[PDB]
Design a protein around this ligand. Structure first.
Ligand SMILES: Nc1ncnc2c1ncn2[C@@H]1O[C@H](COP(=O)(O)OP(=O)(O)O)[C@@H](O)[C@H]1O
Length: 1133
């Protein structure tokens, strides 16, 4: 103990969070130095310096002592250092840490306020602060337990960590180091310690001394404790050597309590010796977890006291070495050494349940769940713990109360993401949602859809998000009320009338994981399913009710795949720990481990015949191993692939093995010999690298389908020729699939949550499957094919019954519709997503179908009665609804049919395609009128006043034909490149402006020169509309920007163009009162004329809407999201 401090060393250390010294200290300079060395030994280059040793051996004090020296600090870590007590944390745990470490580094919000909402995101926010804003800085990680934790800090920093297990640096690369520190200490120091406690100096240090130390085993913790004991009772020097002689502490799990023995005792005694008023107090601290620092106030609420007092009490403890503390900024938070917690949790074992109940109670006596203003030192603590303490005390009532609250949901999420709350619902399900009620799934399924939104600022109106749930759901009832309680307060909540029609309600959803499900598969009999994922476990349920049958902790890392044996006897799993495990489908006990791959493993599949039993695995080691489960060893290793092997199914007839790699080849192996028999290069792409995944065999096993980027391919296992090729969603990437045994059906996981299954051979999508809203990973048919399952990042497996998903539902449509706000009801007409078109009667499902050659656009005749639609080949037809059959079809049109529309009167159809000619079919009579623009390709038109019709194209040209006489009454060359949207001033029509690539020029059907150009928009005005007379015209920009310009020929009224919109502002429209501008693009969003927005609410599952249909009164709406969801909104009662 002395002084090498510099009031600088101070700042740098008190800043970063480094702890100070322990009451009494003994310069272990020999190692303070040992460590320091390895630190300079990093130079500039980032590295890893690990100070490991048995728990309670000094490390944490050693670390601090290392960076407690100016010489080493400046010129090395001149930027500073940051202490981060991590300890043993699960996933959600490390998150609360990182969240903290960020609330500290960007304490200036220098890079967006609000903390990161998840590990990954925090990794970055971190990597930035360390590599700028705080460079040349050291990161001190106190007590690390798992390798993976280090890989999150692997961001070019020089990190000094401490651990009780050196093997934590095997999941990270860099010039690592090691500074071994024994578990014990040396008598001379141990003595020093005692000495400095009793105020002696080895001179008066009794005989016992040398023996006591020998008993405390050197552990500075143990010693110091005893030393604090021998100091508070100067006589028992030999009395205690006696207690320590024989460890009279009795804990369950006697067996081999390593470091305990000496410690448990030290504690046992000192504790029993506390005064009889503060002794009850220390007992309560039995509910404070390892590597968790509590703040003064958390205790005030527990004990009904105040700062000073609560601090004095706890002081007596820190002084006696029964507690620890460090600054937080005038405010103090105290921790407990790991071992001391294990002590207490064992000692006051039978009392733990009550302490967690005495807490919470003391939290309701002072606070409110949804009233914790985020300035209270204790704030955080509660959010990420109140929910735990309650469960940790088993309080069905209490808990359900806090987690079934819309208000807590908001409250918490806005502060720390939904990341935690999501875990919790799953963790505390066992106690939470009991009885019969599924008031859970509701809140659970709630946290899945709108997951992405919560915690993301501008914070969503948690009420609307709820209104969007099933009527039956509690999330709704709580949101319906929350609303009806404020009736008339300038808000107005919209309401999804047909919220019911949508929702492909799968026959069953299962939630058994804490993290993304990466795979699943039915048992041969189809009765069960196994599903492994990043929750590091295996999980097997009934294909019936999801009734859990097995909950194994499979591996010590993420699990990339799993499958059942040929007779459902075993379930094997293979992961990134490079291990392949076989389990007992029955007992679920380990049955054997095959560790031979160099890299992670992915494909693991059993032989199909109930005769022989083998297992084939693919890895990133490029090999493919065949295991003979009846042998302690591997049966083969297929050297062959160029890159990583991904998928691989055994041919029905167990003689061939298929292999699908990243090297762009499909490869057939002869099981018996294990020799490459064929290799199929996938070259359908435009040297280029392509990855082939999912790849199943056909019934007869004389064919095989495989998936590469944006296609599925059917190959003849013989000719090695290609039999069929179906392209998928424009441009994405099939992430998985699975050939069905019957009907040529093949389900495929498209890019992100969208999952559609097709019908090869007819090569036509058969049915879309909107179900998840979080990246889908796996998907496959039950053996018999009757049904299929899906696994995604929303960490849920959902069974689906095939027959039912394929029926022609009006659930999902294309984004080509036409609305009819006929008063007492809204009527939408939409192009189906598969074949015909649907006549939807919003406010009474009533879905009527109409077969057809895959239309390309729809069209309703005001009065209904006649429905018209364009076609893909340019064909046009009209069908009369009353009859719903007799249809009339005119001839014309070379390209597909875009906008098509009926004339004011019941006859004459206008329709533009993808070329210069507009068409005016005055059907019924049969006469035709053409409008040879000679232009380029009419972008779109609009039925003007009296038989006059405004047109515009990729020529900046706008025109005013007149039907019944293809005669150009007006021509304008008002843009040098593609006109995009432009409206008329409806009332009268004195004006009619445009908006092309640049800005929006508004003119007057007269002056063959635009009134005043409206420059500014830095994206490209892609729409606009005039204010129902009101003298205003809003222009929707491309990057979300949206300015409202004023009808005074040329100005620049307010630009309420936030984004801090969501990609493209494809539409707008003013209220009949010229006060409410409602925009549409990535999602709906209203505004307040002249500065500020409004009910910016309503977010849709999907996005990139196009045209938002507003009824007359602005109290009814209709739109469709790129997920085929038809939203028919209508303001709340
Ligand atoms: N050099 C030292 N001098 C005095 N006491 C020490 C010393 N090192 C550790 N201790 C005692 O042990 C505690 C710190 O233990 P710690 O270093 O955090 O264990 P670990 O290294 O396994 O994390 C302190 O409360 C202190 O009384």
């Amino acid at each position: 103990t002395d002084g090498g401090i510099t009031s600088f060393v101070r700042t740098v250390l008190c800043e970063g969070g480094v702890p100070q010294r322990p009451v009494i200290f003994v310069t272990r300079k020999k190692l303070v130095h040992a460590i320091q060395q390895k630190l300079w030994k990093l130079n500039g280059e980032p590295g890893w310096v690990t100070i490991y040793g048995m728990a309670g051996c000094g490390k944490s004090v050693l670390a601090a002592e290392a960076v407690r020296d100016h010489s080493l600090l400046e010129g090395c870590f001149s930027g500073g250092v940051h202490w981060v007590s991590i300890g043993k944390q699960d996933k959600s745990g490390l998150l609360m840490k990182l969240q903290n470490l960020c609330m500290r580094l960007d304490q200036e919000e220098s890079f967006s306020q609000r903390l990161p909402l998840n590990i990954e995101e925090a990794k970055d926010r971190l990597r930035v602060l360390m590599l700028r804003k705080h460079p040349r800085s050291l990161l001190i990680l106190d007590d690390v337990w798992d390798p993976w934790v280090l890989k999150a800090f692997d961001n070019q920093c020089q990190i000094l960590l401490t651990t009780s297990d050196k093997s934590v640096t095997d999941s990270v690369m860099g010039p690592k180091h090691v500074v071994p520190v024994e578990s014990g200490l040396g008598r001379e120091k141990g003595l020093e310690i005692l000495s400095l406690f009793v105020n002696m100096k080895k001179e008066d240090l009794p005989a016992e001394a040398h023996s006591i130390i020998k008993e405390c085993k050197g552990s500075p913790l143990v010693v110091s404790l005893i030393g604090a004991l021998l100091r508070d009772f100067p006589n028992r020097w030999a009395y205690y050597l006696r207690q320590l002689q024989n460890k009279q502490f009795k804990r369950i799990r006697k067996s081999s309590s390593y470091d305990y023995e000496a410690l448990d005792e030290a504690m046992s005694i000192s504790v029993e010796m506390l005064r009889e008023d503060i002794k009850d107090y220390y007992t309560d601290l039995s509910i404070l977890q390892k590597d968790v620092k509590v703040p003064t106030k958390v205790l005030c609420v527990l004990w009904d006291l105040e700062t000073e007092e609560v601090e004095d009490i706890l002081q007596e403890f820190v002084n006696k070495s029964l507690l620890f503390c460090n600054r937080n900024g005038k405010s103090f938070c105290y921790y407990l050494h790991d071992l001391q917690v294990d002590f207490l949790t064992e000692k006051n074992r039978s009392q733990l349940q009550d302490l967690h109940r005495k807490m919470v109670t003391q939290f309701q006596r002072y606070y409110q769940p949804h009233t914790l203003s985020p300035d209270q030192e204790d704030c955080m603590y509660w959010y990420n713990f109140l929910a735990y303490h309650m469960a940790s005390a088993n309080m069905h009532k209490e808990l359900c109360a806090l987690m079934f609250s819309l208000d807590w949901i908001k409250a918490k999420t806005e502060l720390v993401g939904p990341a935690h709350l999501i875990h919790e619902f799953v963790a505390y399900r066992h106690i939470l949602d009991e009885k019969d009620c599924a008031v859970c799934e509701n809140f659970q399924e709630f946290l899945s859809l709108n997951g992405h939104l919560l915690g993301r600022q501008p914070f969503p109106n948690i009420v609307q998000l709820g209104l969007c749930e099933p009527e039956t759901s509690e999330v709704y009832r709580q949101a319906k009320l929350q609303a009806k309680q404020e009736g008339d307060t300038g808000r107005l909540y919209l309401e999804w009338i047909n919220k019911k029609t949508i929702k492909n309600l799968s026959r069953l959803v299962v939630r058994p994981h804490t993290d993304a499900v990466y795979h699943a598969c039915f048992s041969q009999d189809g009765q069960r399913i196994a599903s492994c994922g990043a929750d590091k476990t295996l999980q097997v349920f009934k294909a019936e009710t999801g009734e859990k049958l097995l909950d194994i902790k499979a591996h010590e890392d993420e699990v990339l795949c799993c499958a059942f044996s040929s007779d459902d006897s075993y379930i094997a799993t293979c992961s990134a720990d490079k291990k392949v495990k076989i389990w007992d489908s029955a007992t679920g006990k380990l049955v054997h481990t095959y560790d031979e791959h160099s890299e992670q493993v992915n494909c693991c599949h059993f032989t199909n015949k109930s005769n022989h039993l083998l297992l084939a695995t693919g890895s990133n080691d490029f090999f493919l191993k065949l295991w003979d489960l009846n042998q302690k060893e591997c049966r083969n290793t297929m050297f062959g692939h160029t890159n990583s092997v991904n998928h691989c199914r055994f041919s029905p007839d167990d003689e061939l093995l298929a292999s699908c790699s990243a090297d762009g080849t499909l490869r057939l192996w002869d099981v018996r010999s294990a020799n490459e028999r064929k290799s199929i290069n996938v070259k359908r792409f435009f040297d280029v690298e392509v990855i082939v995944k999912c790849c199943s065999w056909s019934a007869d096993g004389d064919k095989i389908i495989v998936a590469a980027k944006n296609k599925v391919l059917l190959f003849d296992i013989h000719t090695s020729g290609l039999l069929a090729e179906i392209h998928t969603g424009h441009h994405s990437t099939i992430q998985y699939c699975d050939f069905s045994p019957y009907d040529h059906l093949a389900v495929i996981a498209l890019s992100q949550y969208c999952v559609e299954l097709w019908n090869i051979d007819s090569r036509l999508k058969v049915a879309d499957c909107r179900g998840h809203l979080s990246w889908v990973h796996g998907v496959m048919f039950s053996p018999d094919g009757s049904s299929f399952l899906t696994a995604s990042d929303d960490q849920t497996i959902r069974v689906w019954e095939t027959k039912k998903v394929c029926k022609n539902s009006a659930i999902v449509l294309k984004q080509e519709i036409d609305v009819v706000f006929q008063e007492n009801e809204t009527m939408v007409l939409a192009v189906d997503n598969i074949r015909g078109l649907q006549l939807i009667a919003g406010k009474t499902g009533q879905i009527d179908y109409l077969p057809e050659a895959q239309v390309s656009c729809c069209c309703l005749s005001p009065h209904l009665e006649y429905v018209a639609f364009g076609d893909e080949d340019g064909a046009i037809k009209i069908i009369e609804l009353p009859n719903n059959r007799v249809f009339s079809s005119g001839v014309g049109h070379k390209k597909a049919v875009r906008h098509i529309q009926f004339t004011a009167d019941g006859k004459t159809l206008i329709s533009s395609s993808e070329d210069s000619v507009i068409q005016v079919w005055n059907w019924q009579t049969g006469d035709y009128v053409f409008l040879q623009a000679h232009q380029e390709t009419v972008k779109d038109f609009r039925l003007l006043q009296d038989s006059r019709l405004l047109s515009w194209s990729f020529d900046g040209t706008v025109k005013v034909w007149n039907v019944i006489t293809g005669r150009i009454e007006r021509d304008f060359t008002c843009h040098q490149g593609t006109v995009l949207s432009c409206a008329i001033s409806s009332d009268a029509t004195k004006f009619s402006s445009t908006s092309a690539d640049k800005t929006a020029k508004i003119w007057s059907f007269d002056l063959l020169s635009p009134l005043h150009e409206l420059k500014g928009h830095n994206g490209c005005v892609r729409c606009s509309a005039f204010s129902l007379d009101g003298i205003l015209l809003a222009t929707g920009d491309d990057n979300g920007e949206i300015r409202i310009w004023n009808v005074s020929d040329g100005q620049l009224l307010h630009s309420c163009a936030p984004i801090s919109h969501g990609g493209w502002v494809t539409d707008v429209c003013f209220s009949p009162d010229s006060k409410t501008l409602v925009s549409a693009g990535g999602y709906l969003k209203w505004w307040n004329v002249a500065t500020g927005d409004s009910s910016q609410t309503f977010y849709t599952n999907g996005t990139n809407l196009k045209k938002i249909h507003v009824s007359p009164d602005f109290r009814t709406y209709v739109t469709v999201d790129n997920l085929g969801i038809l939203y028919i909104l209508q303001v709340l009662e």
